[PDB]
A and B are shown apart, each in its own frame.
Chain A
């Protein structure tokens, strides 16, 4: 026999005859594997990037402005880790570029922004493929092949130089065109290729490759580099499409898409996934959903961050429901990590007001104690946690540990019971007046000081146990003090012993 249920603080107790209690306090294994999340500084600086506004259907906080960028996380990761690569590439493709220099008109601006982005993407790809190709150049035994490989590293100049040196001068000149998108050169190169591929008794295997690069359509083609699929990282070939490929005529997106249309990427590879989401443009969400059911390369946190960035930057569009789905999932992972402040922060990116309300409330009340320690916990409860919720939760924590100002801001009767000094009573009376049970009020008014009515009220309250008896005894004492004939008898009509002594 075994037993196990989930805790309030979502964790698990099981039969365990090895402890002291006969159960085990198990810290639920958190899927959330990303170091900087457990450090509260990250969370503080992350809240600094947000503008919280109360809802239009309730007072609960939800995010109005976010300036979060894939860029921002990079400081908290190793520049060597694959994770860093994911976040970086994601920054390059999705975070807005700024172009500081003023531009004659705005379509120009747009064009510059495209060139900039393109240049960074292609410099980065070259960063990645770098060693692969350098290895390949190490092992080549043929100069023209080396020239080609230098083109694989998007180094037009060293290709040109080696050409020059290996006495391949004309080629060298031709090479200098790579990366200007001169359509003349494009159609000429392609022409030369058809003429060869119709007779052309023999053309060197790598010169044809280089001409194919000048053609602007290196796989899309009839002398196709597609077979290099088996000799190079998919990223390496994509570099070829992006650098040569037809830069001007295409948007970065539809260009990348063009390439992807020619080659299936491995399902599991995440830098692949990011390119696909980038290229998918018109239906990122569609693809994102597809990506979800196929692989786990994108983690809960990343998927949430992505969706949120794209949402708050106009970059892309996601369903309220998909954004909320992502948000739920991550908030939950966080709560499983006892990261309540952080889960709380994430919970605010919910679109559904009802759900936000519930989630937030439930968590704050269940976990108020921990959420009231440092200033990094203060800014937390100064997200826009409703005054009501915070004190209410705090009221609950008091009833359970065995407050009054919060109550002032049934239960009230029980509080009066616990209280059973004059100044405190007066303050309570003032609070009650401000708010404006009736029996208690009459009694208080009498104490501060019709009398029969107050008496009947107090008796009724007593009937409605220890506190009531105390109040009755107090009233008796007060009456005795006042006395110190028929009216007195009417008012009168251990306690029993006292009554007997009185009679």
Chain B
């Protein structure tokens, strides 16, 4: 019985899968092609676990999950036995996304809850949490993705149809908002920064209004460029939008039971692939 898992994540080396469903449990699997052997079940949430997410193995085996109970739960495998080492629930509503930073930033976490907040939880020397939060969106935040870089930034997708790009500032000590972008007529479900250290940067912003805008910024200066992936509404509401590391392929999880794939061509416009 597992009729509706909401999220699954793969580890750096892809040996250990972590699905999370609505029955609150987070199941860990030892994958091996056809055979993912169930190795664990983790019960510690008071509502459907929306998302799970491993951290960089530089930090051992850590997994921050966020669930409907408004609480972010950090887990850790310890000698082959899992244990909830920390927790961070400074959010007064259902926590939706949770995504670790680039490991060069430390062990930073990115939480994004319906109380219009998004936190960046550091784990200090005592391993204890150091929350520095910001208000992100009015009617709630559905997602928040990290950006790689070599001047840190992230993106957030809102319930007010916004897509925001925040940046760290030593003057403020809290992430200062630097640019917001408007293009959807309904809850911005998911937002994704692309890991392509190439000439430009790409953002795929899927939404409830069955659109997927792509914000391509020329460089550090010139603002973004709006590009409706295709100019027809998808047969059903879109949920997830993920970039590929090698290649800059875009995967779109629409509520129409297939996942589409879009690649950029020399026109600059995007074309299906599969």
Contacts and interface: CB of A to CB of B under 8 A. Distances in A.
A231 B17 CA distance: 63
Contacts of B6: 1, 3
Contact of A4 (B242, B245, B256): B242
Interface stretch (A40-48, A205-213, A278-286, A393-401): A393-401
A336 B253 contact: no
B172 interface: no
Contacts of B58: 396, 399
Interface stretch (B31-39, B107-115, B129-137, B160-168): B31-39
B236 to A, nearest CB: 9
B227 to A, nearest CB: 18
A292 B239 CA distance: 33
Interface residues of A, number: 44
Interface stretch (B88-96, B173-181, B211-219, B266-274): B266-274
B27 A6 contact: no
Interface stretch (B7-15, B68-76, B116-124): B7-15
Contacts of B9: 5
A400 B247 contact: no
A9 interface: yes
Nearest to B51: A3
B255 A2 contact: yes
A8 interface: yes
Contact of A399 (B14, B60, B242, B247): B60
Interface in A1-45: 1-10, 12-15, 17, 19-23, 25, 29, 31
A21 B242 CA distance: 20
Contacts of A29: 274
A23 B12 contact: no
A365 to B, nearest CB: 9
Contact of B31 (A15, A25, A336, A343): A25
Contacts of B197: 354-355, 358
Interface string B71-105: 00000000000000000000000000000000000
A399 B60 CA distance: 6
Contact of A2 (B17, B60, B257, B267): B257
Interface in A442-466: none
Contacts of A316: none
A295 B68 CA distance: 50
A1 B8 CA distance: 14
Contacts of B36: 19-21, 25
A22 B5 contact: yes
Contacts of B147: none
Nearest to A27: B33
Contacts of A190: none
Contacts of A397: 13
Interface string B222-258: 0000000000000000011011111101011111110
Given A2-B259, A400-B11, 14 more contacts: A5-B240, A5-B242, A6-B244, A6-B245, A13-B8, A13-B10, A20-B29, A21-B5, A21-B29, A22-B21, A332-B246, A363-B246, A396-B57, A400-B57
Interface of A: 1-10, 12-15, 17, 19-23, 25, 29, 31, 289, 292-293, 328, 331-333, 335-336, 343, 354-355, 358, 362-363, 366, 369, 396-397, 399-400
